[PDB]
Coordinates of C-alpha atoms in Angstrom, one line a residue:
Chain A
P4 CA -22.4 88.0 -71.5
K5 CA -22.6 86.8 -67.9
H6 CA -23.0 88.8 -64.8
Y7 CA -25.4 91.3 -66.4
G8 CA -28.9 90.0 -65.5
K9 CA -31.4 88.7 -68.0
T10 CA -32.2 91.8 -70.1
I11 CA -30.9 93.6 -73.2
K12 CA -31.8 97.3 -73.9
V13 CA -31.1 99.6 -76.8
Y14 CA -31.8 103.2 -77.9
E15 CA -33.8 104.5 -80.9
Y16 CA -33.5 108.1 -82.0
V17 CA -36.6 109.9 -83.3
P18 CA -36.3 112.3 -86.3
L19 CA -36.9 116.0 -85.8
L20 CA -40.3 116.3 -87.5
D21 CA -42.3 113.4 -86.1
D22 CA -45.2 113.6 -83.6
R23 CA -43.2 111.4 -81.2
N24 CA -40.7 114.3 -80.6
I25 CA -42.3 116.1 -77.7
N26 CA -40.4 118.8 -75.8
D27 CA -40.5 122.4 -74.6
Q28 CA -37.6 124.0 -76.5
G29 CA -39.9 125.6 -79.1
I30 CA -39.7 129.3 -80.0
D31 CA -41.9 130.5 -82.8
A32 CA -40.9 133.0 -85.5
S33 CA -42.3 135.9 -83.6
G34 CA -39.9 135.1 -80.8
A35 CA -42.5 134.0 -78.3
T36 CA -42.3 130.7 -76.5
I37 CA -44.4 127.9 -77.9
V38 CA -45.5 124.4 -76.7
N39 CA -44.0 122.2 -79.3
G40 CA -40.4 122.1 -80.3
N41 CA -40.6 120.5 -83.7
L42 CA -41.6 122.8 -86.5
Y43 CA -44.6 120.6 -87.5
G44 CA -45.4 117.0 -86.9
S45 CA -46.3 114.4 -89.4
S46 CA -48.9 116.8 -90.7
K47 CA -49.4 117.5 -94.4
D48 CA -51.9 120.4 -94.0
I49 CA -50.8 123.4 -96.1
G50 CA -52.3 125.8 -93.6
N51 CA -50.4 124.4 -90.6
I52 CA -47.2 124.3 -92.6
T53 CA -47.6 127.9 -93.7
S54 CA -48.4 129.0 -90.1
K55 CA -45.4 127.2 -88.7
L56 CA -42.7 127.9 -91.3
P57 CA -39.4 129.2 -90.1
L58 CA -39.0 132.7 -91.5
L59 CA -36.1 135.1 -90.9
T60 CA -35.7 138.9 -91.0
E61 CA -32.3 140.6 -91.5
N62 CA -31.5 140.4 -87.7
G63 CA -32.6 137.0 -86.5
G64 CA -32.1 136.5 -82.8
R65 CA -33.9 133.8 -80.8
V66 CA -36.4 133.2 -83.6
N67 CA -36.6 129.5 -84.2
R68 CA -35.6 126.7 -81.8
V69 CA -36.0 122.9 -81.9
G70 CA -35.4 119.8 -79.8
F71 CA -35.0 116.1 -80.0
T72 CA -36.0 112.8 -78.3
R73 CA -35.0 109.2 -78.0
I74 CA -36.7 105.9 -77.1
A75 CA -35.6 102.6 -75.5
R76 CA -36.5 98.9 -76.1
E77 CA -35.9 95.7 -74.1
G78 CA -36.1 91.9 -74.1
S79 CA -35.6 89.0 -71.8
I80 CA -34.8 85.2 -71.7
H81 CA -36.3 82.1 -70.1
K82 CA -35.5 78.5 -69.3
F83 CA -37.1 75.2 -70.4
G84 CA -36.5 71.5 -69.9
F85 CA -38.0 68.0 -69.5
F86 CA -36.7 64.5 -68.8
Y87 CA -37.6 60.8 -68.6
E88 CA -36.4 57.7 -66.7
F89 CA -36.3 53.9 -66.9
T90 CA -35.1 50.7 -65.3
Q91 CA -32.5 48.1 -66.2
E92 CA -34.8 45.1 -66.6
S93 CA -36.9 47.1 -69.1
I94 CA -33.8 47.4 -71.2
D95 CA -32.3 43.9 -70.7
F96 CA -35.5 41.8 -71.1
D97 CA -37.3 43.9 -73.8
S98 CA -38.1 42.3 -77.2
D99 CA -36.0 44.5 -79.4
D100 CA -32.6 46.2 -78.8
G101 CA -32.0 49.8 -79.8
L102 CA -35.0 51.1 -77.8
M103 CA -32.7 53.8 -76.3
Chain B
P20 CA -51.5 148.4 -83.5
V21 CA -50.0 149.4 -80.2
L22 CA -48.9 146.6 -77.9
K23 CA -48.2 146.7 -74.2
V24 CA -45.5 144.8 -72.4
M25 CA -45.4 143.7 -68.8
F26 CA -42.4 142.2 -66.9
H27 CA -42.3 139.9 -63.9
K28 CA -39.1 140.0 -62.0
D29 CA -39.2 136.6 -60.2
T30 CA -40.0 134.3 -63.1
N31 CA -38.3 136.4 -65.8
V32 CA -41.4 136.3 -68.0
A33 CA -42.3 139.2 -70.3
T34 CA -46.0 139.4 -71.4
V35 CA -47.0 141.0 -74.6
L36 CA -50.7 142.0 -74.6
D37 CA -53.1 144.6 -76.1
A38 CA -53.3 148.2 -75.0
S39 CA -56.7 147.7 -73.3
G40 CA -55.6 144.5 -71.6
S41 CA -54.1 144.3 -68.1
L42 CA -52.5 141.7 -65.8
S43 CA -52.9 141.1 -62.1
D44 CA -50.1 138.6 -61.7
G45 CA -47.9 141.2 -60.1
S46 CA -45.9 142.4 -63.1
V47 CA -44.9 146.0 -63.9
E48 CA -45.5 148.0 -67.1
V49 CA -42.3 148.7 -69.0
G50 CA -43.5 150.4 -72.2
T51 CA -45.4 150.2 -75.5
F52 CA -44.6 149.8 -79.2
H53 CA -46.1 149.2 -82.6
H54 CA -45.9 145.6 -83.7
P55 CA -46.0 146.5 -87.4
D56 CA -43.3 149.2 -87.4
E57 CA -44.3 152.3 -89.3
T58 CA -41.0 152.7 -91.2
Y59 CA -39.7 149.1 -91.2
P60 CA -42.8 146.8 -91.4
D61 CA -41.1 143.5 -92.4
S62 CA -37.8 144.2 -90.7
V63 CA -38.3 143.7 -87.0
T64 CA -40.5 141.3 -85.0
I65 CA -41.8 141.3 -81.4
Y66 CA -38.5 140.1 -80.0
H67 CA -36.6 143.3 -81.2
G68 CA -39.2 145.6 -79.8
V69 CA -39.2 143.8 -76.4
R70 CA -35.4 143.9 -76.3
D71 CA -35.4 147.6 -77.1
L72 CA -38.0 148.3 -74.4
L73 CA -36.1 146.2 -71.8
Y74 CA -32.8 147.9 -72.5
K75 CA -34.1 151.1 -70.8
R76 CA -35.2 149.6 -67.5
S77 CA -33.2 148.8 -64.3
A78 CA -32.0 145.4 -63.2
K79 CA -32.8 145.7 -59.5
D80 CA -36.3 147.2 -59.9
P81 CA -37.9 147.1 -63.4
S82 CA -40.0 150.1 -62.3
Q83 CA -37.1 152.6 -62.6
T84 CA -34.6 153.3 -65.4
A85 CA -30.8 152.7 -65.5
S86 CA -27.7 153.2 -67.6
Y87 CA -25.7 150.6 -69.6
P88 CA -24.1 148.4 -66.9
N89 CA -27.4 148.1 -65.0
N90 CA -30.0 147.2 -67.5
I91 CA -31.7 144.0 -68.5
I92 CA -29.7 142.9 -71.5
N93 CA -29.5 139.1 -71.1
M94 CA -32.3 137.8 -73.3
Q95 CA -31.4 134.1 -72.9
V96 CA -33.2 133.7 -69.6
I97 CA -36.1 136.0 -70.5
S98 CA -39.2 134.2 -71.9
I99 CA -41.7 136.1 -74.1
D100 CA -45.4 135.2 -73.5
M101 CA -47.8 136.4 -76.2
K102 CA -51.4 137.2 -75.3
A103 CA -52.2 139.8 -78.0
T104 CA -54.1 139.0 -81.2
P105 CA -51.9 137.7 -84.0
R106 CA -51.0 140.2 -86.7
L107 CA -53.1 140.3 -89.9
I108 CA -51.2 139.0 -92.9
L109 CA -52.2 138.5 -96.6
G110 CA -51.7 134.9 -97.5
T111 CA -53.0 135.3 -101.0
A112 CA -52.9 138.5 -103.0
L113 CA -54.9 139.6 -106.0
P114 CA -53.2 139.4 -109.4
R115 CA -51.9 142.8 -110.4
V116 CA -53.4 142.9 -113.9
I117 CA -56.2 140.8 -115.4
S118 CA -56.8 140.8 -119.2
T119 CA -60.0 139.6 -120.8
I120 CA -62.5 140.2 -123.6
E121 CA -66.0 141.5 -123.6
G122 CA -68.7 139.0 -122.5
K123 CA -66.6 136.8 -120.2
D124 CA -66.9 136.2 -116.5
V125 CA -64.0 137.1 -114.2
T126 CA -63.3 136.1 -110.6
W127 CA -61.2 137.6 -107.8
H128 CA -60.2 135.6 -104.7
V129 CA -58.3 136.8 -101.6
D130 CA -57.3 134.9 -98.5
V131 CA -56.4 136.5 -95.2
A132 CA -54.9 134.8 -92.2
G133 CA -54.6 135.9 -88.6
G134 CA -56.5 138.6 -86.8
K135 CA -59.5 138.3 -84.5
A136 CA -62.5 136.4 -85.8
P137 CA -64.8 137.2 -87.5
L138 CA -63.6 139.0 -90.6
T139 CA -65.6 141.4 -92.8
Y140 CA -64.9 141.9 -96.5
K141 CA -65.8 145.0 -98.5
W142 CA -65.1 145.5 -102.2
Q143 CA -64.6 148.9 -104.0
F144 CA -64.4 149.9 -107.6
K145 CA -62.8 153.0 -109.2
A146 CA -63.7 154.0 -112.7
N147 CA -61.1 154.5 -115.4
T148 CA -62.3 158.1 -116.2
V149 CA -60.3 161.0 -115.0
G150 CA -61.2 162.5 -111.6
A151 CA -62.7 159.2 -110.2
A152 CA -62.6 157.9 -106.6
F153 CA -63.3 154.5 -105.1
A154 CA -67.0 153.7 -104.5
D155 CA -68.5 150.7 -102.8
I156 CA -70.0 148.0 -104.9
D157 CA -73.7 147.5 -104.1
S158 CA -73.9 144.3 -102.0
Chain C
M25 CA -32.6 145.4 -88.8
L26 CA -33.6 145.7 -92.5
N27 CA -32.5 149.3 -93.1
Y28 CA -32.5 148.0 -96.7
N29 CA -36.3 147.7 -96.5
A30 CA -37.7 146.9 -100.0
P31 CA -37.1 149.6 -102.6
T32 CA -39.9 148.1 -104.6
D33 CA -43.4 148.2 -103.1
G34 CA -42.8 151.8 -102.0
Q35 CA -40.5 151.3 -99.0
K36 CA -37.3 153.3 -98.8
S37 CA -33.9 152.0 -97.7
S38 CA -32.3 153.9 -94.8
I39 CA -29.2 155.1 -96.7
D40 CA -31.3 156.5 -99.5
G41 CA -32.8 159.9 -98.9
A42 CA -36.5 160.8 -99.3
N43 CA -35.9 162.1 -102.8
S44 CA -33.4 159.7 -104.3
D45 CA -33.9 155.9 -104.8
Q46 CA -31.9 152.8 -105.7
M47 CA -30.7 152.9 -109.3
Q48 CA -31.2 149.2 -110.0
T49 CA -33.7 147.0 -108.1
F50 CA -34.0 143.9 -110.3
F51 CA -32.2 141.6 -112.7
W52 CA -33.2 141.2 -116.4
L53 CA -32.4 137.9 -118.0
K54 CA -32.6 139.3 -121.6
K55 CA -34.0 135.9 -122.8
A56 CA -37.5 136.3 -124.1
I57 CA -40.4 133.8 -124.0
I58 CA -41.7 133.1 -127.5
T59 CA -44.4 130.8 -129.0
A60 CA -44.0 128.5 -132.0
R61 CA -45.9 128.8 -135.2
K62 CA -49.2 127.0 -135.6
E63 CA -49.0 123.9 -137.8
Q64 CA -51.0 123.5 -141.0
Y65 CA -52.9 120.4 -142.2
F66 CA -55.0 121.5 -145.2
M67 CA -52.2 123.1 -147.1
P68 CA -50.2 119.9 -148.0
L69 CA -53.4 118.4 -149.5
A70 CA -53.8 121.1 -152.2
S71 CA -52.4 120.5 -155.7
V72 CA -51.2 123.5 -157.6
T73 CA -52.3 124.5 -161.1
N74 CA -50.3 127.1 -163.0
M75 CA -52.0 130.3 -164.1

């Protein structure tokens, strides 16, 4: 629409378990604070998965915490044009009609 | 193992660190506890022990003790920082019973995660005869 | 707050005393695993002669 500039933007929402999801809400199974919120990134290591699995005792308080992230995109528009010009004699006295 | 807990009033950060270790940030010592509990090993984690230790101390000055209305019982603001060595867990366990015939090779494999590197392994063997005790295998 | 602990592996639940123990600690499916009979190949070849 008009009166909105020359740009369009949109959000993209990242899943929970990707590497792009970076935040500080993490709490590991022991209850201590941890750097990364997501349980594990796009990592297929069995050792890392075993280390970072969410495990629960009978009483689970403040054990495993997660977070989320979103991304934005954009695009813009431009203007183009060209022209040409002539005279009346060039049209009247030319050999063939239909030049226009 | 025995763990030692220190509390910083201004930043509301509780530090869990070994018995020998110490901190000069300005925190105070609240108490100690065994991370693998003697009676309930797989029942309680570090969070429960820290909460139980903090229940005793006073809100105004964590140096002194207080009754119920005046403790530190809000664990949402408190952050737990871990500096002690991670507990030693058994990722892979030996099969309970192995059956074989005479003249065949047998193999035992064990995997241990956590702890403080490096790790040392020792194997022991107890004879099937009556009145036998574990003896080291000659390395 | 596992006052249940694990009755197997030697741990004791809190309600149970030092002497007693849980009566039942597992489930038994009562469906057994069996293996099939080995197949025979040389037997169909033989031709029988009466004695």
